[PDB]
Ligand binder design. Sequence first.
Ligand SMILES: O=c1ccn([C@@H]2O[C@H](COP(=O)(O)OP(=O)(O)O)[C@@H](O)[C@H]2O)c(=O)[nH]1
Ligand SMILES: *[C@@H]1O[C@H](CO)[C@@H](O)[C@H](O[C@@H]2O[C@H](CO)[C@@H](O)[C@H](O)[C@H]2O)[C@H]1O
Ligand SMILES: *[C@@H]1O[C@H](CO)[C@@H](O)[C@H](O)[C@H]1O
Ligand SMILES: O=C(O)c1ccccc1Br
Length: 444
Amino acid sequence: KRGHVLAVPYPSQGHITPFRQFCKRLHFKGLKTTLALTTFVFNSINPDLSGPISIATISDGYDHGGFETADSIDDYLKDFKTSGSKTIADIIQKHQTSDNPITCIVYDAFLPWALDVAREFGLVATPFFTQPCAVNYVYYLSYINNGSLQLPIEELPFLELQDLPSFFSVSGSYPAYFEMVLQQFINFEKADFVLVNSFQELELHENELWSKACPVLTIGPTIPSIYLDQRIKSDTGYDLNLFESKDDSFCINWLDTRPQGSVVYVAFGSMAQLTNVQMEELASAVSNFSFLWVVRSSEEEKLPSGFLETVNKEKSLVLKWSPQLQVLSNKAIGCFLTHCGWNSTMEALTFGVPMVAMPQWTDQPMNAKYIQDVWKAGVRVKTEKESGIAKREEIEFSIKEVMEGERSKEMKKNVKKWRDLAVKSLNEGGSTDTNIDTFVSRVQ
Ligand SMILES: O=c1ccn([C@@H]2O[C@H](COP(=O)(O)OP(=O)(O)O)[C@@H](O)[C@H]2O)c(=O)[nH]1
Ligand SMILES: *[C@@H]1O[C@H](CO)[C@@H](O)[C@H](O[C@@H]2O[C@H](CO)[C@@H](O)[C@H](O)[C@H]2O)[C@H]1O
Ligand SMILES: *[C@@H]1O[C@H](CO)[C@@H](O)[C@H](O)[C@H]1O
Ligand SMILES: O=C(O)c1ccccc1Br
């Protein structure tokens, strides 16, 4: 009972969620955990503090208004390094005289400066990569190559330019985040372990390639236990949400009244923004089906005028935010039109829902390539090259290709094999269970 982990996610939904889920595993194994949330995020969730994972607050330098009040991404990340370094040190010091001092920092691999704080206080230090091995390996190769990548890549020859992360195909875009994803490897060989939110059996070739450069421990998937191994009965869903849902039994009740495999689920995660024109083609494309579509509140203005009040409430429904895990488990869902964020992708792969891949940026084009051509669990929509948008009739074709045809009945079979491989990996003796045990043993 001696070890104590301070877990520091990048302050966004797709990073806080896998960090918290991993903390629930550690707690089940006997390791005490504290999750470090920025003050802005903490005051937005109003979290329920009566739980097995304690909460501490740190600062990114934007306590009042968070990221949207920062001038720029580069200013945000530099100020987060400054204030985050000092406020993470504050938590360590405040726990020094306690019953269980902090002994280990699990920090988002996006924040390599947290290793320096852990090492200053003599702690165990492990970066946590929330993206899959193939993506991280691609970034590692570019980092070794002064931030460039010459295709073809010898060990992954099937990768074309349109499959690499967006920073390689959109020249000069988001230079501060490009630098961030490359500099995850600036010091990662000096950490006690390298953790990755994937499971070995999902990416055998890339895991072993990446491991040759630096030993990594796959510890995923971070899907709640009740849906897979079921050894942690208290782990029944995601319990830290940065977004309000109107208490959606509304959503699951409605899905129950629908025929099996009849609903197209459409969701673009917590972050990605679609243009006016993109929303136009999407709304026209999906209105050919029975659909459940998350349109985040900030995105509604880009819907075509009068769209919300012309959805027929017998076949279709539009939400501000969904209980995605419950949606993807419900049998009324025929396919998942997704931006190919890594958590959404892994959730779809484990629940056996075939995907229509509509990647937008960052690692999403990589996940899309793996969804279609490696795991063969869905189809990527084609975007015209001069314009860069996917029009309504290609989107509609891609959804049909996954709902009905001969291509359809193949991809349903393939995607159903991943759930068992994940349950095997999380159960006693599995790949991920063994790696989590290795980490827990070191921490204490
Ligand atoms: O309406 C929604 C949309 C997304 N999610 C959850 O939000 C996370 C999105 O993370 P992902 O890595 O897919 O995308 P990002 O948001 O990081 O771009 C996932 O855990 C989803 O299950 C949800 O609960 N409801
Ligand atoms: C990274 O930069 C992009 C803009 O290019 C921001 O969207 C992102 O900010 C995130 O925004 C989410 C809401 O859409 C917040 O939930 C999240 O906390 C915040 O980090 C930047 O991270
Ligand atoms: C950065 O750019 C992409 C568009 O390519 C968008 O999806 C994000 O919302 C934005 O932050
Ligand atoms: O890749 C991601 O998921 C990501 C998430 C949040 C902020 C920046 C990035 Br580059």
